[PDB]
């Protein structure tokens, strides 16, 4: 298993614009298009992203290409984040995948806000971090996914995804 596969499970794959769990227009593999309510605005961002007049539908290839860019940008965000980088640098490869996932779902900014879990993660206090991470809106809103990522931080294995 690896990051891509992991996120592909968590986000799914859809080739027509859809609304995510917060009600925002998304496409493909969790690629957010816009926080705005206008479908047109979404459609507009879609075409700009893709480089052509899609009329709200793309091919698998195009989805995957977004997806790759998005995975890349998440990594690069972490690395450039003063609060994130260090945590990430201290982690093992499986757990890094966990931090990526969160970042992908919630943005650097959002994740950098779990100061306390970050710190526990850094210190390798697995069970503790797992408890603290669960005290969050994130966990209450999307509990199954959050359970998956948390188990991953906790155990450092891919069990939650097998
Ligand atoms: Cl883009
Ligand atoms: Cl969920």
Swiss-Prot record:
Enzyme class: hydrolase
Keyword set, alphabetical order: Antimicrobial, Bacteriolytic enzyme, Cytolysis, Glycosidase, Host cell lysis by virus, Host cytoplasm, Hydrolase, Viral release from host cell
Active-site feature positions: 11, 20
This protein's encoding gene: E
Name of the protein described by the UniProt record: Endolysin
Gene Ontology molecular function, alphabetical: lysozyme activity
Record organism: Enterobacteria phage T4
Gene Ontology biological-process annotations: cell wall macromolecule catabolic process; defense response to bacterium; peptidoglycan catabolic process; viral release from host cell by cytolysis
Mutagenesis / variant outcome for changing residue 117 to V: 50-fold decrease in enzymatic activity
GO cellular component: host cell cytoplasm
Impact upon substituting residue 132 to M/F: 2-fold decrease in enzymatic activity
Keyword Ribonucleoprotein: no
Annotated effect of mutating residue 26 to H: Facilitates transglycosylation more effectively than hydrolysis; covalently bound substrate
Keyword hit for Mitochondrion: no
InterPro entries assigned to the protein according to its UniProt record, in alphabetical order: Endolysin_T4_type, Glyco_hydro_24, Lysozyme-like_dom_sf, Lysozyme_dom_sf, Phage_lysozyme-like, T4-type_lysozyme
Residues that coordinate or bind substrate: 32, 104, 117, 132
Result when mutating residue 20 to A/N/S/T: Complete loss of enzymatic activity
Entry function: Endolysin with lysozyme activity that degrades host peptidoglycans and participates with the holin and spanin proteins in the sequential events which lead to the programmed host cell lysis releasing the mature viral particles. Once the holin has permeabilized the host cell membrane, the endolysin can reach the periplasm and break down the peptidoglycan layer.
Impact noted for substituting residue 11 to A/F/H/M/N: Complete loss of enzymatic activity
Family: Belongs to the glycosyl hydrolase 24 family.
Listed EC numbers: 3.2.1.17
Induction statement: Expressed late in the viral replication.
């Amino acid at each position: 298993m690896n990051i891509f596969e992991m996120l592909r499970i968590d986000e799914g794959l859809r080739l027509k614009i859809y609304k995510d769990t917060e009600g925002y227009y998304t496409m493909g593999i969790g690629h957010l298009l816009t926080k705005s309510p206008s479908l047109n605005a979404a459609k507009s961002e879609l075409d700009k992203a893709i480089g052509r007049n899609t009329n709200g539908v793309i091919t698998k290839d195009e989805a995957e290409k977004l997806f790759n860019q998005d995975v890349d940008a998440a990594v690069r965000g972490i690395l450039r984040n003063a609060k994130l980088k260090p945590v990430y640098d201290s982690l093992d490869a499986v757990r890094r995948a966990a931090l990526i996932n969160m970042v992908f779902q919630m943005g650097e900014t959002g994740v950098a806000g779990f100061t306390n879990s970050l710190r526990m993660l850094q210190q390798k206090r697995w069970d503790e971090a797992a408890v603290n991470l669960a005290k969050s809106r994130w966990y209450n809103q999307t509990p199954n996914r959050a359970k998956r990522v948390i188990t991953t931080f906790r155990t450092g294995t891919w069990d939650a995804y097998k």
